[PDB]
Amino acid sequence: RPKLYVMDNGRMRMDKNWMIAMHNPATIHNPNAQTEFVEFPIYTVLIDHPEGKILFDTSCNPNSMGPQGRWAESTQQMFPWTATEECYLHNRLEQLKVRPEDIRYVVASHLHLNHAGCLEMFTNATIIVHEDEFNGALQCYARNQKEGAYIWADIDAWIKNNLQWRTVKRHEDNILLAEGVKVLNFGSGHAWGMLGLHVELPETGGIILASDAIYTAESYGPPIKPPGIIYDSLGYMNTVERIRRIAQETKSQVWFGHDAEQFKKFRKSTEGYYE
Amino acid sequence: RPKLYVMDNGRMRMDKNWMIAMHNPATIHNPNAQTEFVEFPIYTVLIDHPEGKILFDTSCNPNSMGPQGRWAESTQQMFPWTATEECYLHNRLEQLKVRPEDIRYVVASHLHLNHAGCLEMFTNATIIVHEDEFNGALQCYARNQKEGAYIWADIDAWIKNNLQWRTVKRHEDNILLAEGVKVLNFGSGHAWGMLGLHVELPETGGIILASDAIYTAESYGPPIKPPGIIYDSLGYMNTVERIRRIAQETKSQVWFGHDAEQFKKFRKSTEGYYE
Ligand SMILES: [Co+2]
Ligand SMILES: [Co+2]
Ligand SMILES: [Fe+3]
Ligand SMILES: [Fe+3]
C-alpha cells in the first residue's frame, strides 16, 4: 500500500549539553571541563499514502543561514546548519516527483527552527500542530522575539502564506490521519507541545517517529538522559517512557529525532523507501 | 521577641552549569567551551523563638568528605565541601549556647546532601519535610543508591537515630510553626519537594528563606535562569515567581540558598543576629 521516505535535510552542530544535559560535569581535577560541538542529522519523512501524502517535519528554511539569513547571528553560531541544495526539502521532494501542493497533511512535531523551517511551502496542506506549541510560537512572534529556536521570519511567512492549521488540543486523543498513520499527542516536554507519528507499514511493520521527544539512543537509554533544551522535564520523562511502552506493545521501531548512527543506517530517498 | 542567626557551615564548589543550566554554550568559534568550578556558601538559619527554637536546614555531615567519608568519591569530587571545625553546625550552635536537644523544629528545605547532613543530631525535634522529598530519598535508600545528592549513610543515620518526622502533604497549606514563622510548601522544582520559611521579624521585617528554590540572584533575575540540578522545570519556574509575588506583597527580603555575594553581606552568628 504505502511508501515511506527518509529525506536527508542536512546536518546541524550544537553543544552536547543541549543534547545530553550535564554530559561531562566539572570536577576538582577538571574544574574547567570542556564540552563538544556535536553534529546531528536533520531529516523529514514522507508517507506516500493512497489516502494522501503525509509529511512529518519540514527541516530548516533555505534562507536560514548566512548574512541575509532569517536566523539571528547568535542562533547561526550556536546551532549552525550545513546543507547542500540537494538537502533542501523542496529538492528532496522534487527528486521524488512530489510538489508541495501534493501534500495533504503536514505534521509538525514541534515548531523549532529545524523542524518547521519549510511549513510555508505547504499552502494546500492541513498543518497539524500541538495547540500549546502553536500558541507558544505565536507569542514569540507577537513579542517580537528575534533570538531563540522560534524563527520570527519563519512564523511571519506562515501567516503571510495563509497556512491552514489543525491544532491538537492538550487533552486530545491520538488522531487517525490515515490507515496505519496515527498522530501521537506527546504533549509538553522538549517543547510546549510535541507530536509524534505511529506508522504501521505492511512489510516494515510499526514505526514511531519520536522527533525531539527523543534526541538519540543515548537519550533513550535506559536510563533516560534528558536534554538541555527542555521546557517540561517531567512531561519529557513521561513521554520517553510512554514511547518505550508503545514500542514494546506494538513491536514498533523508534526513530529518534537527531541520531547520527541510526540515520546512517536508514535507507534515504536517494536509495529507496519503506513499505 | 525572636533572634534569627545565620550560621556559616562552610563552602562548596561545583560546575556552574549545575547552578545556571547552559550558562556558556559552545559556538562555531568556541566549540569546546569551558565551564567554571564556582564556590558557594552552605548556611543554616536558627530562629531562637520564645515558642521554641526553629532550625532551617542542617548543612553537611562532619564525616561527609575524605577517604572514610559518607559521600561517595564521585560526589566528593563533583561537589567538594570545605569546612573548618568552627563551620560545623554542632559547633556553630555550641557557640550560641544551643544544644541539639534544644531544637523543637527542624525544617528541611529538601534532603540534598548539603541541607540534610546533620538531621541526625536533632533527636528531640520535629523534622518538617515535604512528603514527596521524604519518599524520594527513602527510595534512594531502599534501592541502595550510593551515588547522587541523597547520602545513603545520612539517611541510614536518620532511621537509626529514630527521628520524629512531620511530612508536609503535597497539597497542604502553609504551616504556622510559630508567631511570625510560616513553613512555605513550594512543592516540586529543584527537588521532589521544597519547603521555604517566611519569617516576620519585629525589627528586620519579612524574610523568605528560599533555599535551593532560588540558588542565586542570577537565578532570580528577572528573567529566571534555571539550574542544571532540577526535577520539575515547570514547578521550579512557578515557585520562583511565587516567591517574587510573596516578597512583593509582604515587602520581604529573599534569602537565596547559595549566593556568595548575598552571604557576604549577611550578619553571621559570630557577629550577631536579626530581630
Ligand atoms: Co527541538
Ligand atoms: Co539542593
Ligand atoms: Fe530538533
Ligand atoms: Fe543546596
Residue numbers in the entry:
A (entry chain B), B (entry chain A): 9 to 283
Paper lines:
MLLs degrade N-acyl-L-homoserine lactones (AHLs), molecules that are used in a microbial communication system called quorum sensing (QS) to coordinate a variety of behaviors, including virulence and biofilm formation. We provide the structural and biochemical analysis of the lactonase GcL (WP_017434252.1), isolated from the thermophilic bacteria Parageobacillus caldoxylosilyticus. GcL is a thermostable, highly proficient lactonase with broad substrate specificity (kcat/KM values range between 104 to 106 M–1 s–1) for substrates such as N-butyryl (C4) L-homoserine lactone (HSL) and N-decanoyl (C10)-HSL. The binuclear center, common to all MLLs, is coordinated by five histidine residues and two aspartic acid residues.
Asp122 is also conserved and is involved in coordinating the metal cation. To investigate the importance of these residues, we therefore substituted Tyr223 with phenylalanine and Asp122 with asparagine in GcL, eliminating their role in acid catalysis, and kinetically characterized the resulting GcL variants. The alterations in GcL activity may still suggest that this residue is important, but the interpretation of this effect is complicated by the clear role of this residue in metal coordination. This could be seen through crystallization, where multiple conformations were captured: one where both metals are present at high occupancy, exhibiting an active site configuration very similar to that of the wild-type enzyme; and a second form where the active site shows no bound β-metal (or bound with very low occupancy). In the case of the Asp122Asn variant, the Asp mechanism is no longer accessible due to the mutation of Asp122, leaving only the terminal hydroxide or concerted mechanisms as potential options. Curiously, in this variant, the activation free energy for the terminal hydroxide mechanism increases substantially, leaving the concerted mechanism as the only energetically plausible pathway with calculated activation free energies within 3 kcal mol–1 of the experimental data. Visual examination of our EVB trajectories indicates that during our simulations, the substituted N122 side chain interacts with and stabilizes the terminal hydroxide ion at the Michaelis complex, contributing to higher calculated activation free energies through reactant state stabilization.
